[PDB]
């Protein structure tokens, strides 16, 4: 019923890395880095792979910070998104044909040009709180219903 995805936020003391998607699903929005988890690959390894593929950064330690389930009206498959954070990275962000990474000061996170669910859970991530969320969408821009709570265990 659900498909596994990862989402990685590089969050440092005063700034966070986001990527502008240049084409495809979510073009024109800023977001974290991630994608589908592969056959035979752990969710964490998938998260590391996708951060490295999409941003050009090398990550050692990833930390589990959340789980978000997305439901899209009209679509049978739910998205089961495992959210991770890291402070410690190597390399510098790389712009590719698919993604333009940029650093944002924490007071200047571009919520109006991010997925609408981010306005709910990002503030939790910034204060190092872990969460479980569920968002029902109609299209890409409208949240019909949601739940969100803080958790001790992701």
Q: Known binding site for Mg(2+): residues?
A: 34, 50, 53-54, 98
Complete DSSP assignment for 87-98: S-EES-----SS
Site string for a copy of itself, 125-144 (x = CB under 8 A): -----------x--------
CB atoms closer than 10 angstroms to residue 62: 19
Residues lying near ligand VGH in the complex (CB under 6 A) are found at 5, 7, 25-26, 31, 34, 70, 72, 79, 81, 115, 117-118, 137, 140
Residue with tokens 């969710």: 43
Please state the closest distance from residue 153 (CB atom) to a copy of itself, in A.
16
Please state the closest distance from residue 130 (CB atom) to a copy of itself, in A.
16
145 contacts Cl ion (rule: CB under 5 A): yes
Q: Which residues contact 106 (CB under 8 A, 6 or more apart)?
A: 14, 15, 16, 126
Please state the closest distance from residue 79 (CB atom) to ligand VGH, in A.
5
Q: Which residues contact 75 (CB under 8 A, 6 or more apart)?
A: none
Give the integer Cα–Cα distance in Å for 26 and 89: 25
The residues that touch a copy of itself, with contacts defined as CB under 8 A, are 136, 145, 147, 149
């Amino acid at each position: 019923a659900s498909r596994l995805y990862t989402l990685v936020l590089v969050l440092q003391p005063q700034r966070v890395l986001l990527g502008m998607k240049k084409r495809g699903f979510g073009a024109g929005r800023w977001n974290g880095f991630g994608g589908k988890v592969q056959e035979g690959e752990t969710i964490e390894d998938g998260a590391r792979r996708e951060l490295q593929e999409e941003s050009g950064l090398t990550v050692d330690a990833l930390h589990k910070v959340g789980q978000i389930v997305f439901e899209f009206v009209g679509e049978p498959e739910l998205m089961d998104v495992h959210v991770f954070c890291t402070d410690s990275i190597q390399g510098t962000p790389v712009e590719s044909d698919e993604m333009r990474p940029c650093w944002f000061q924490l007071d200047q996170i571009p919520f109006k040009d991010m997925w609408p669910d981010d306005s709910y859970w990002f503030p939790l991530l910034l204060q190092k709180k872990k969460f479980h969320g569920y968002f029902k969408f109609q299209g890409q821009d409208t949240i019909l219903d949601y739940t969100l709570r803080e958790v001790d265990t992701v």
